[PDB]
């Protein structure tokens, strides 16, 4: 599933990758 990173402008299709990706973005867990 297309997962757009509003911060980067990019987009994934894998939940874990984008989640861990936004985890770094958010600074949270
Ligand atoms: Zn990003």
């Amino acid at each position: 599933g297309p997962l757009k990173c509003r911060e980067c402008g990019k987009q994934f299709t894998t939940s874990g990758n984008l989640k861990r990706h936004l985890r770094i973005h958010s600074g949270e867990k």
Side-chain angles (χ1 to χ4, degrees):
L3 295 177
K4 175 78 66 174
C5 178
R6 183 185 182 220
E7 309 304 295
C8 287
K10 57 188 287 171
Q11 182 177 89
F12 285 83
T13 190
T14 311
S15 178
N17 285 94
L18 193 270
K19 267 305 316 187
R20 188 182 68 190
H21 185 73
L22 297 192
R23 178 176 181 141
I24 304 175
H25 275 285
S26 304
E28 271 296 85
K29 310 78 182 178

